Design an enzyme around this catalytic site. Structure first.
Site, mmCIF file in Angstrom:
data_model
loop_
_atom_site.group_PDB
_atom_site.id
_atom_site.type_symbol
_atom_site.label_atom_id
_atom_site.label_comp_id
_atom_site.label_asym_id
_atom_site.label_seq_id
_atom_site.Cartn_x
_atom_site.Cartn_y
_atom_site.Cartn_z
ATOM 1 N N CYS A 90 -0.788 -20.013 -1.636
ATOM 2 C CA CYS A 90 -0.066 -19.571 -0.440
ATOM 3 C C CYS A 90 0.558 -20.692 0.409
ATOM 4 O O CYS A 90 -0.119 -21.650 0.781
ATOM 5 C CB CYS A 90 -0.998 -18.757 0.451
ATOM 6 S SG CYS A 90 -0.188 -18.082 1.936
ATOM 7 N N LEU A 91 1.846 -20.562 0.726
ATOM 8 C CA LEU A 91 2.531 -21.569 1.551
ATOM 9 C C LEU A 91 2.372 -21.259 3.026
ATOM 10 O O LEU A 91 2.595 -22.125 3.869
ATOM 11 C CB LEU A 91 4.026 -21.631 1.220
ATOM 12 C CG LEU A 91 4.360 -22.150 -0.181
ATOM 13 C CD1 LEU A 91 5.841 -21.981 -0.460
ATOM 14 C CD2 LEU A 91 3.953 -23.608 -0.282
ATOM 15 N N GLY A 92 1.983 -20.024 3.339
ATOM 16 C CA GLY A 92 1.814 -19.652 4.730
ATOM 17 C C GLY A 92 0.397 -19.722 5.257
ATOM 18 O O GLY A 92 0.133 -19.232 6.362
ATOM 19 N N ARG A 101 0.846 -1.189 0.000
ATOM 20 C CA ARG A 101 0.000 0.000 0.000
ATOM 21 C C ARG A 101 0.880 1.237 0.000
ATOM 22 O O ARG A 101 0.906 1.990 0.977
ATOM 23 C CB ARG A 101 -0.882 0.015 1.240
ATOM 24 C CG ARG A 101 -1.860 -1.118 1.285
ATOM 25 C CD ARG A 101 -2.662 -1.066 2.553
ATOM 26 N NE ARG A 101 -1.808 -1.242 3.719
ATOM 27 C CZ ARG A 101 -1.284 -2.403 4.098
ATOM 28 N NH1 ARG A 101 -1.522 -3.511 3.403
ATOM 29 N NH2 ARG A 101 -0.518 -2.457 5.181
ATOM 30 N N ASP A 161 2.624 -8.498 6.702
ATOM 31 C CA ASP A 161 1.511 -7.774 6.112
ATOM 32 C C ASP A 161 0.345 -8.578 5.546
ATOM 33 O O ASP A 161 -0.259 -8.185 4.542
ATOM 34 C CB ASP A 161 2.057 -6.807 5.048
ATOM 35 C CG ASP A 161 1.127 -5.632 4.799
ATOM 36 O OD1 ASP A 161 0.516 -5.128 5.769
ATOM 37 O OD2 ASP A 161 0.997 -5.222 3.626
ATOM 38 N N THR A 162 0.012 -9.690 6.187
ATOM 39 C CA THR A 162 -1.118 -10.482 5.729
ATOM 40 C C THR A 162 -2.065 -10.751 6.900
ATOM 41 O O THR A 162 -3.079 -10.064 7.048
ATOM 42 C CB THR A 162 -0.663 -11.817 5.075
ATOM 43 O OG1 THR A 162 0.133 -12.562 5.996
ATOM 44 C CG2 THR A 162 0.154 -11.556 3.811
HETATM 45 C C1 HEM Z 1 -4.277 -14.220 5.694
HETATM 46 C C2 HEM Z 1 -2.985 -14.501 5.248
HETATM 47 C C3 HEM Z 1 -2.452 -14.687 3.968
HETATM 48 C C4 HEM Z 1 -3.050 -14.519 2.736
HETATM 49 C C5 HEM Z 1 -4.518 -14.126 2.554
HETATM 50 C C6 HEM Z 1 -2.072 -14.862 1.733
HETATM 51 C C7 HEM Z 1 -2.309 -14.841 0.365
HETATM 52 C C8 HEM Z 1 -1.398 -15.252 -0.621
HETATM 53 C C9 HEM Z 1 -1.781 -15.381 -2.008
HETATM 54 C C10 HEM Z 1 -3.170 -15.018 -2.577
HETATM 55 C C11 HEM Z 1 -0.736 -15.946 -2.668
HETATM 56 C C12 HEM Z 1 -0.656 -16.236 -4.164
HETATM 57 C C13 HEM Z 1 -0.236 -15.001 -4.937
HETATM 58 C C14 HEM Z 1 -0.041 -15.277 -6.410
HETATM 59 O O1 HEM Z 1 -0.479 -16.338 -6.895
HETATM 60 O O2 HEM Z 1 0.553 -14.427 -7.087
HETATM 61 C C15 HEM Z 1 0.310 -16.183 -1.655
HETATM 62 C C16 HEM Z 1 1.545 -16.767 -1.899
HETATM 63 C C17 HEM Z 1 2.443 -17.037 -0.852
HETATM 64 N N1 HEM Z 1 2.229 -16.767 0.512
HETATM 65 FE FE1 HEM Z 1 0.696 -16.020 1.409
HETATM 66 N N2 HEM Z 1 -0.862 -15.262 2.326
HETATM 67 C C18 HEM Z 1 -1.097 -15.133 3.687
HETATM 68 C C19 HEM Z 1 -0.146 -15.392 4.686
HETATM 69 C C20 HEM Z 1 1.160 -15.778 4.423
HETATM 70 C C21 HEM Z 1 2.143 -15.998 5.458
HETATM 71 C C22 HEM Z 1 1.887 -15.845 6.949
HETATM 72 C C23 HEM Z 1 3.290 -16.344 4.863
HETATM 73 C C24 HEM Z 1 4.481 -16.555 5.578
HETATM 74 C C25 HEM Z 1 5.703 -15.948 5.247
HETATM 75 C C26 HEM Z 1 2.999 -16.405 3.426
HETATM 76 C C27 HEM Z 1 3.832 -16.943 2.460
HETATM 77 C C28 HEM Z 1 3.470 -17.147 1.128
HETATM 78 C C29 HEM Z 1 4.374 -17.689 0.157
HETATM 79 C C30 HEM Z 1 5.786 -18.227 0.392
HETATM 80 C C31 HEM Z 1 3.764 -17.622 -1.035
HETATM 81 C C32 HEM Z 1 4.373 -18.086 -2.329
HETATM 82 C C33 HEM Z 1 3.893 -19.427 -2.884
HETATM 83 C C34 HEM Z 1 4.314 -19.629 -4.333
HETATM 84 O O3 HEM Z 1 4.626 -18.628 -5.016
HETATM 85 O O4 HEM Z 1 4.337 -20.784 -4.797
HETATM 86 N N3 HEM Z 1 1.681 -16.036 3.182
HETATM 87 N N4 HEM Z 1 -0.132 -15.778 -0.402
#
Ligand code: HEM
Length: 406
Positions: A349-351, A178, A243-244
């Site tokens: 998402c991995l998290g 943002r 930031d999620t």
């Molecule tokens: C409410 C919490 C969260 C939401 C809604 C969220 C959402 C997302 C979304 C929508 C994507 C896919 C983006 C794309 O396809 O371009 C993503 C990818 C990812 N998220 Fe989250 N996320 C959250 C929490 C977290 C947390 C806590 C971590 C920890 C560091 C994290 C790590 C990742 C990673 C590593 C990816 C990459 C997976 C890949 O590219 O194969 N996320 N996230």
């Protein structure tokens, strides 16, 4: 707003100047503001002249579709505006299969289910401590008092980074999701990588058991990960960590602060909390990034041109009435909570396991000690929009006589 010149190949009837960083009806709430893209007068796939000009898929079926076809919709430039998508080089997100596959495997080792299960006690402890600490105050600024410290410290703990670096780190990630106009994305990017580079080399020489150490010394392609790759993977983890869940928690608490019946429901039927978690994740979805056309392509009757950027709002799928009836109503008993809150396709998402854990724990632990609460009177809650949306401030108040230490 400053609209960009309508490209020759874009039909005028497909135009709808939606600004993802400042939606017209933001005062009704950020999800509501984005839901206007789903009104009857709006085509399923439109073109906005804002933020440089790009397409926006407004329906769950098209978003899921585009996310599954990485062959046409590359992750190589996943952010709007274009400058942001370019300076963006995070791993595994800036990569399309089969490449991101190996990197996705390594990031999973540091944030996957096994890690979450092992950290569950710590997560539970922190939530209990934070909440018991506030329970008697009879009031609090949820965004700074809980939503921020709870998930961030858990992440700092998991990453092996000092809680003292939080202010500096949080400002930099918020700048990426943002932007306030203070610096370009590449600069916020650099500032973030400047902080990591020394740490990565450090933990490369003297490996520890923290996530950064694991990543920095991990292996991909049968060989060792480079410092660059390690840094790009960690930049993403920082964003997901700071930031999620941080933002999502406030949307949900704002809601519960106004839904006494919904609180009572989870209080009495805690077995419902995991379902409530999924439904709130649908209703208060908050992410929105996209892809880039690898070549000219006809999608659902619309001519897309090589280089064209297309926003595929993860947030919109579950809000689409076609996917969930009465999408704006929160029903913990939905037979099927359909959404793409954590993404779709090869970049799921991995998290999300960590996120779900953090959310479920908050719901349980908070409602136990502070069952009855509401938004401070006169307070005006405001939202903010971007790649990840959030809540400005969330003043809550309650009678300590109604709370209870456990
Ligand atoms: C409410 C919490 C969260 C939401 C809604 C969220 C959402 C997302 C979304 C929508 C994507 C896919 C983006 C794309 O396809 O371009 C993503 C990818 C990812 N998220 Fe989250 N996320 C959250 C929490 C977290 C947390 C806590 C971590 C920890 C560091 C994290 C790590 C990742 C990673 C590593 C990816 C990459 C997976 C890949 O590219 O194969 N996320 N996230």
């Amino acid at each position: 707003a400053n609209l960009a010149p309508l490209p020759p190949h874009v039909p005028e009837h497909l135009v709808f100047d939606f600004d993802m960083y400042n939606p017209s009806n933001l005062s009704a709430g950020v999800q509501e503001a984005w839901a206007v893209l789903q009104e009857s007068n709006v085509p399923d796939l439109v073109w906005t002249r804002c933020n440089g000009g790009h397409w926006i898929a407004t329906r769950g079926q098209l978003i899921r579709e585009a996310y599954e076809d990485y062959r046409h919709f590359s992750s190589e430039c996943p952010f709007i505006p274009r400058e942001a998508g370019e300076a963006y080089d995070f791993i595994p997100t800036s990569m399309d299969p089969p490449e991101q596959r190996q990197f996705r495997a390594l990031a999973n080792q540091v944030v996957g289910m096994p890690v979450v299960d092992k950290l569950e006690n710590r997560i539970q402890e922190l939530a209990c401590s934070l909440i018991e600490s506030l329970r008697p105050q009879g009031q609090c600024n949820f965004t700074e008092d809980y939503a921020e410290p709870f998930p961030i410290r858990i992440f700092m703990l998991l990453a092996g980074l000092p809680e003292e670096d939080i202010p500096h780190l949080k400002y930099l990630t918020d700048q990426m999701t943002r932007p306030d106009g203070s610096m370009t994305f590449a600069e916020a990017k650099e500032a973030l990588y400047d902080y990591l580079i020394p740490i990565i080399e450090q933990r490369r020489q003297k490996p520890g058991t923290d996530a950064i150490s694991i990543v920095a010394n991990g292996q991909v392609n049968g060989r060792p990960i480079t410092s660059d790759e390690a840094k790009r993977m960690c930049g993403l983890l920082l964003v997901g960590g700071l930031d999620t869940v941080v933002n999502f928690l406030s949307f949900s608490m704002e809601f519960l602060a106004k839904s006494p019946e919904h609180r009572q429901e989870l209080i009495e039927r805690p077995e419902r909390i995991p379902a409530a978690c999924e439904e709130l994740l649908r209703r208060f979805s908050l992410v929105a990034d996209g892809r880039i056309l690898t070549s000219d392509y006809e999608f659902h009757g619309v001519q897309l041109k090589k280089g064209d950027q297309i926003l595929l709002p993860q947030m919109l799928s579950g809000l689409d009435e076609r996917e969930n009836a009465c999408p704006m109503h929160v029903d913990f008993s939905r037979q099927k909570v359909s959404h793409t809150t954590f993404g779709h396709g090869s970049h799921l998402c991995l998290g999300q396991h960590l996120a779900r854990r953090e959310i479920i724990v908050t719901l349980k632990e908070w409602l136990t000690r502070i069952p009855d609460f509401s938004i401070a009177p006169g307070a005006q809650i405001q939202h903010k929009s971007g790649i990840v949306s959030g809540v400005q401030a969330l003043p809550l108040v309650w009678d300590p006589a109604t709370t209870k230490a456990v």
